[PDB]
Amino acid sequence: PVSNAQLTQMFEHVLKLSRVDETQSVAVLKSHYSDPRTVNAAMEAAQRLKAKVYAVELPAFNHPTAMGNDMTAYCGDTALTGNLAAQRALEAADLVVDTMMLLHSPEQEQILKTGTRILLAVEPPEVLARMLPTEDDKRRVLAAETLLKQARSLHVRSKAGSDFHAPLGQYPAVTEYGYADEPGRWDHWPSGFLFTWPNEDSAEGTLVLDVGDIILPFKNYCRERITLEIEKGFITGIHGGFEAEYLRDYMKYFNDPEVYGISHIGWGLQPRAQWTAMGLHDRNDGMCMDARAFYGNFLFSTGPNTEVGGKRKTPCHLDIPLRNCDIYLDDKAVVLAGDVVAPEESRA
Amino acid sequence: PVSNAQLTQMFEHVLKLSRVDETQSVAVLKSHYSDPRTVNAAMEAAQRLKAKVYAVELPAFNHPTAMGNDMTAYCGDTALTGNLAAQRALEAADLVVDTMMLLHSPEQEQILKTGTRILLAVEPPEVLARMLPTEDDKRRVLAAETLLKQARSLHVRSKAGSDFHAPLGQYPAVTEYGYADEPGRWDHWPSGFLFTWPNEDSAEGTLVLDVGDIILPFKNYCRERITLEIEKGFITGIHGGFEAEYLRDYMKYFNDPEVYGISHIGWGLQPRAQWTAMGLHDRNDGMCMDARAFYGNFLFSTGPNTEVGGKRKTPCHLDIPLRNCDIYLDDKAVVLAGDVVAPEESRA
Amino acid sequence: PVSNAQLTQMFEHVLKLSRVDETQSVAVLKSHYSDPRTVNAAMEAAQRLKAKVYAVELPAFNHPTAMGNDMTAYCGDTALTGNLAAQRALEAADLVVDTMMLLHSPEQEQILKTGTRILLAVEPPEVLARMLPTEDDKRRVLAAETLLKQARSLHVRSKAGSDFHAPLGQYPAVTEYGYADEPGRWDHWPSGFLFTWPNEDSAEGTLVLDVGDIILPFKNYCRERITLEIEKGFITGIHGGFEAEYLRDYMKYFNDPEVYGISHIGWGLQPRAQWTAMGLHDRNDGMCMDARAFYGNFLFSTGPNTEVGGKRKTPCHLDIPLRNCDIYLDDKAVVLAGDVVAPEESRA
Amino acid sequence: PVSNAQLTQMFEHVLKLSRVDETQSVAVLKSHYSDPRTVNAAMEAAQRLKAKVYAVELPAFNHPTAMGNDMTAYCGDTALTGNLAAQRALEAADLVVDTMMLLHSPEQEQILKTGTRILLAVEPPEVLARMLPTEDDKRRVLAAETLLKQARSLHVRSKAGSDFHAPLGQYPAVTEYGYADEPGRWDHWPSGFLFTWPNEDSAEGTLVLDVGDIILPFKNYCRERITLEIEKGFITGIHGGFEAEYLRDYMKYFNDPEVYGISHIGWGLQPRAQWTAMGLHDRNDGMCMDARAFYGNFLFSTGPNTEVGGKRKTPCHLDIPLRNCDIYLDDKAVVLAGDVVAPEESRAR
Amino acid sequence: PVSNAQLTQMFEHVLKLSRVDETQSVAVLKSHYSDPRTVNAAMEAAQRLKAKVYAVELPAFNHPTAMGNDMTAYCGDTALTGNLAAQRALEAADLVVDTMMLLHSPEQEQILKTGTRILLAVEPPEVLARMLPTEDDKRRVLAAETLLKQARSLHVRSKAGSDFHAPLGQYPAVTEYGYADEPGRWDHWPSGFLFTWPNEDSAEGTLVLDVGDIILPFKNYCRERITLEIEKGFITGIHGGFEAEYLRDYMKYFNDPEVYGISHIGWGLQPRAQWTAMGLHDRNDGMCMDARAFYGNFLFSTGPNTEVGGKRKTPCHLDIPLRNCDIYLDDKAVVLAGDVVAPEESRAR
C-alpha cells in the first residue's frame, strides 16, 4: 500500500508534469466524501512546488433517483450547479485538482474555457501508483490521436459477433494521458486512452458483450453474452441471458429514450491497466479506470453526449469495454484481436 | 452523495411525520458501529423540531457463530438482553431513533408496549434519500393491509415453477411504510411493504428461486434455479446447482431443524426501491432494503417467528424476494407477474 | 502521564470500591466537552466488572452570562433541566458516572432520592491517579464526620486576621472520600474532605484571604490580602488591593444580593492534594480539586445553598481555601495552624 | 459485532495462550493500514498481562505492479526489506504481534531465527472472535502433524478429476493452531490447519477446481471448472472456461515462470471455519482465513517457496482450497470425500 | 502558525544538519501525548531523505506523586525504565527523534554509549520555527565550549546579590546547538546554550532570583526576590516572600534531601530565544526553551546529576535562568550585565 510520504511525492511528480510551479495557482476541489489523504497530498505537493494553493470545499449534491456509490452512474447536475461563486473560485486558479468528480458537466466546460486546466484524481492511492503518469504515455496517446483526427469512420469486429460501424468527422477526438499540462484542458490520473463520438444518428450494427466483457458501473464480468443491436446511433435491441435482463431493467428505470444513444467510442492504450484488476476490488473502491483504459480494448458508452454539444442530457451513463476486438479507422486496423498494431509509435 | 445539511433536513421531515415536536422526547440509540453522520443528523433534527433529546450508547453485542457483518443474519440476544436499565432509558422517550439495529426481541416488544415508538434508520444516507418516506406510501400500504387482514389464504404461483399455499388467520398483518407516527409503532426508514405469517405447520408446495432472484443475507442474484419443497410449514427439500448446495451448507451449519420453518410472507409496494440496486452496492453497505421492498415482489422468510408468538427462536434467518410472481389472497390476485393489481388504492 | 490501559484499571479500582459488580447497572453521563478517554475507560471498566453499562449523552447547556470554562462558576440550570426523560434514563441505573458535572442542582437530588448513586469524575487523568481513592481515605473522612455531626459551632482564627464564627446544627454534614459506594449518595473522584453549612442568617466575623490563599474559579494565589466582613451570614465588606477590586467587580456583575451569602464550610483531609498544584496547571485543565481538598485547609464558599434546602438559588459561586488556620468545633480544635490535630484517627 | 472491551479480552486470552507474562516483551508491528482497534487491543492486553510492550510502525511499502488490496497478493519485498534497524527492533522482542503481515518474506524467517515468536492478527474482529484459538485445536492439529511428519508422499483424488501426487521428506511440516506459544515459531490467529511442501521439481498429476472451489486472493466461488496439469512441480496447463482465462491472464501478468510452481500443500482442521463464509464478506474485509482453514479441505498453493529455503522468490501467490477430496499420506487416507478420517485424535466433536 | 508542509520542510532541514541520509536509520520515539503533527513531519522528512524510518511507541509512564504536565517535572523514571527490548529497539537506530523526552534518565546515556545520537523535539511547531537551528549557532556554541573546557572555576555576581562560586573540572562541558550530527551525542531542537556541573559538594555562596527571574517548571516571572544560600553544593536556605514560600513547599513535598543539590550551570547563547516569550504562552504549551536559552542568561539547576555519573537520583528538578549577571570563568568574564562579551566568536551578529 502507499504511504503518505509516497502519495505526496507522486503528486509532486504529476503536478510538475502538469506544469505547476512558482507562477501557478492550484485549487484543490473537495467534498465530504473526498479521500482526505489524497486531498492533503495534493495540498502539500503544491506547496512544495511553491505554487499558490487553496482548497475549495463544496457541500455534496445528491440525485434522489441515483443508485449505488459510483459517481459516473448519474450524469446530471453537480455541486457546482447553481453555485456561480464557487465556480468563479475555481476559475481563479490555473489548475484544479478535482477530487470530487465534475466531468460531463457544463460547469466544467465553462471553467476550461477560461484557460483553467483540470486534473481529476479520485482513484485509490495504490491504483494511482500502479498507473503513475509518464511523458511516454502522453507521446503514445498523441500518436494515436493523430490517426483518429484524420479518420472518417471507425469499425469494430469480433469473433463473438461484434460488427459495428460509426461515421466520424462531426466531433473532435479527446485524449487522456494522465496529466493536465495544457491550458483549458481536462485529464484524469490515471488514464491512457482516447475516444471520439460518432456522427449524429449514424452509428449502426451489432456490439456483442462476450463472456468476460464488462459493464460499468455494474462492475461485473459477463458470464453470458449480451447482444446490442444499434440503428441510427441508438440501441434498439438488448438480447441474451440474465445480464441482458438486468441491463434492460436498469436502462428502463430512467424512463428516457436518450439512455440508448451511443456516446463516445475509442480504444485503450494503458498497458499498466489490467482487465483482471476489477475482480480484485470492491465496488465502492472507485470507478475502475483499469477497465476503461486497458491496452487494446474497444470502449463504447451510452447516454449523454452534451459535453461535445450533442443532443442528449440524460443522466444514465454506461462504459462498456470489449476484449479481443478488431478496430479499424477507415480501412486501417489500429487494434487486431485486442492487440494494438497501429500506429507503431503508440504501441508499448 | 448526501450532505450533512441534507441529511439533517431529511430527518426533520421523517421525525415530523413520526409526530416529533416540542411535546416529545427522543432517544437516539447507537453503538460503536453506528454511522456517526446519521446519529448526528437525528440528534440535530430532533432539537430543531424542539423535542428533548439524548443519545443512548450500548456496547456492541457479539454472536460468536454469526458469519459476515449483516445484522439480520443472526437473530439471537441483543445488547438489551438482561439490561433492564438500558431498556428503561429507551422507554423514557416517546420515540427511539434506532441506529444500531435492535432485532425484533422481547425487550423491543416490551418497549413498544409502553407506547414508545421506534424508528429504525441504518441504511446509508443516499439510500435513505432515494426512499424518503411519504404519506402516500403509508396510504397505499394501509390499503393493502386492509385486504390482507381479511384473507384466509395466500397463494403464490410463477412460470418458473412456484406453487405455494399458506393458510392465514392465526397471525396478524404487519406493515412498514417508513415512519413511526402512532404510539407503540415500530417502523423502518426505508420500507414500503407488508407481510403476515402462515398458520402453524400449514404451508405447502413449491417455491422456486429463478435466475435473478435473491437470497438475503447472501446478496447474490441466482444464476441457476433453486427449488424449495415445503410441507407442513417447513422446507424439506432444497434442490438445484451450486447456489442450492451453498444454501444447504449454510442452513445445516446452525445444526437446528428450526431454520427450515417458513416465517413471514407478503409483497412489496415500494416503487422507488429497485431489484437492480443490490448489484450497485457492496455487502457491508447495509442490509439491502431495496431487495425486500421493491414493488410487486413476493417476499418470504425462514427461521425465527417468536416475534409473533410462534415457537421458533432459531438464529438463522433468510429473506428471499421473488420476481414475476402471481400472489393471491384467497382467490383474488393482488399481484400478477410481478405487478401490483389489487387493491387499486395500493398501486403507484 | 496516564496511559489508556492504566486509566481503565484505575476506573476498575474505583468502581469496585463503588460496589459495581455483575448485579449493577452503570450509566456514563457525557456531553460533547467530556474527556473521551475518561468516558471510554469508564465504559470499559464497567464491562470488565460485568456490569450492565450504557452511556447517556446530553446536548450541552449554555448559561449566556457565564464567563470562562469552569463548570462550577455558574450554578443554575443544567442540561438535565426540563429533560425529564434523560433524568429517568439516569435514574434507571444503580450508579451514574458523571463526566459532565451536575452537582448543586435539583435534578441530581431527585436522582439520588431514587437510590441511584453518583460519582463525579472530570479532573485530568493524571490528577485522578495522584489522588486515586482508598478505603483508608474514607475511614479518615468518616472519623471527622462523626465529630462534625455533634458540633454546634464552628470557629476559624488565623494570624493573618481571620476571626469567624458559625453556629451549626440546622444542616447536615457532607463527606467526599472519592467513591460512590452507598446508595442514594454522591461523591467526587478525587477529593477527601468534609463540610457543613452554618445556621441560616447566623455566620459572623472576619475571614482574611492571606497572601497565598486562593479563590476558585479565579485560580490565583493572592498577592495582596482580601478582608471579608461577614454579618448575619452574608459578606458585607470586601477590602484590600487589586484582588479585592477584582472580586468586588466580579460579584457585582451577577446583580443579585444572594451572591454574598456564606454557604458551605469545612476542612481538608487529602494529603495527596497539594496547595502548590494549582500553579502547575492552566485554568482550563479542570476545577482544581487540589485547592479544595488539601490537608488542613479551611474551605468556605459563597452563593447557592438550596442543595441542602437554603434560601439561595443564585448562580454565582466561589470556593475559597485558606491556609495556616485554626479550626475549632465548639471548644475543641480539629486543625491548628493548618495541621490536622483532631480527631487522631483522621490524621495522615 | 465485537466491542472494544471484548476485543481487548480476546487478546488477553490469546496472548496468555502465547505465554505472554511479566517476563516477556511484546512488539506490536503496524503500518498506516493496520486496523487501529486491533492494534490498540493488543497493546492494552499486553500491558494488562504486565508484559513490557511497545509498538513498531513502518512506512507502508507499495509494489508498483501489485493489484487490489489483499496482503497476500504481492509476496515480495516488505516494509522491512532493507530496514535492518527495524528488523533488530522486532528481534529484541520475545513475541511480535504482526498486524501488517510479514509472512512469505525472508526477514520473517530471520526474526524467527533469533528465538522471537510471531503471531499474525489481521482478520476482522468478528472473525477473530468466531475462531478464538483453543488448546484443543492445538492438540488436534499436532496429532495430524505426527502423521504428516511420518509420510513419504501425499496424494489427492476427487470425483471431479483431481489425481495429484507429491513426494515428501525434503521439507518440514508447518502447523497453524492460532497462537504463538513456542519460541522461534510463527502462527496466525485464526487458523487450525497444517501443510508442507513437495520435494523440488517433483509434484505430478492433475488438480481440478470444481464448481464451488475457491481461488485466493480472487475470492470467488468457481462457477465452471478449471483443470490444472502439473509436471515436475510446475503447472504446465490451465484449461476451462472464463475462470480459467481469468486465471491464465492474472498469472502471466507477472512475467515470471516461477509463478507456476506448486508451493505448500495440506488440509484443513478448523470446523469453526466455514467454506460458505467468503460469500458473506467483501473483498477488502481481509484475506479470508475461513477458506484456508475449513475442516477437510485440500489446500494447495502456487508461487514462492523461499520461506523454507526453496528456489522461488516470485511475488505471484495463490491459495486454492478444494472440497470433496480424498487425501492420502502414502497409502493411508487422512480425509475422505472432504471429511477428516485420520488420525482419530485430530477430528472435531 | 506553521503549516503541515512547512513543518515537514523544517524537519528536512534539521535532520540533514543531523547527517541523516540514505545510509542512516531513524527511530521516531513517541507516546500517546506526543504531538502527532511533529511525529508525522519527522517520519515523512526522514523518508524524503531516504533514511530507513520506523516509529517506536511506548505506553505512557505516570509517576503517582508527579504534579502538572511539564515533561521535566518528575525526572528519573521514564516509559523506558525496565523495558530492555524497547531500549534495544532504539539502539538499533543511528538517530532517535525523541518526541516524548528521555533526558535526565539513565537509559538515555546508555543509548548514547552505543553510538546512537538523539534529537529531542517537543516544543510547539511555531517555537521550533522561530529558533530553527543553524550552523552559525553551532559555531558560536563551540567557540564558547572551548573556553568552558579550559576553565577551573565559574563565578556569578549580580547587583541583586548573587555571589556564587563553583569549582570546575570534574565534569565535562555539555553543548546544545539544536541538532544531533555527531554520533553518541544528544541535542535539543530548539537550544543554543551550554553548561557543565560543579565539582561534587563544592558549590558555595548565594544566588538571588531577582524580580523578573524565572523558575521552571513553575513558569512565573518572580515578582519578589528569592535568596538561595548554598554550601558544599547544596541549597541550605530559601528566603523571601510568597515565591520563596511556594518554592520551599514544592521542594520539601518530594521528601528527599537530594532536591537541594546544585546541578548543571552555564549561560545562554541564543538571541532568537527571548526572556519575554514565556509570558505569551500557557503552561501546557511546552517546557519553555526560550527561558533556558536566551542570550546572556545565567542558568542553574537543582536536583539530579546522574546523567554525568553523579550521586543523585532525585526526581524534583528545577531550571532557573537569571538576568543581568556577570559570569566569570576563572578571572575572565564571559557575560557582563547579561550581555555576552567573550569569546568574541561566540557573540551574536
Ligand SMILES: O=CNC(=O)/C=C\C(=O)O
Ligand atoms: O422486518 C422486516 N424487514 C425489515 O425491515 C428489515 C430487516 C428486518 O428487520 O428483518
Ligand SMILES: O=c1ccc(O)c[nH]1
Ligand atoms: O477517464 C475517464 C473517467 C470517466 C469517464 O466517464 C471517462 N473518462
Ligand SMILES: O=c1ccc(O)c[nH]1
Ligand atoms: O468535590 C467538589 C467539587 C465541587 C464543589 O463545588 C464541591 N465539592
Ligand SMILES: O=c1ccc(O)c[nH]1
Ligand atoms: O495463515 C496463513 C495465511 C496465508 C498463508 O499463505 C498461509 N497461512
Ligand SMILES: O=c1ccc(O)c[nH]1
Ligand atoms: O534542553 C534542555 C532542556 C532541559 C534541560 O535540563 C537541559 N537542557
Ligand SMILES: [Fe+2]
Ligand atoms: Fe462514457
Ligand SMILES: [Fe+2]
Ligand atoms: Fe425475515
Ligand SMILES: [Fe+2]
Ligand atoms: Fe462551594
Ligand SMILES: [Fe+2]
Ligand atoms: Fe500459499
Ligand SMILES: [Fe+2]
Ligand atoms: Fe536542569
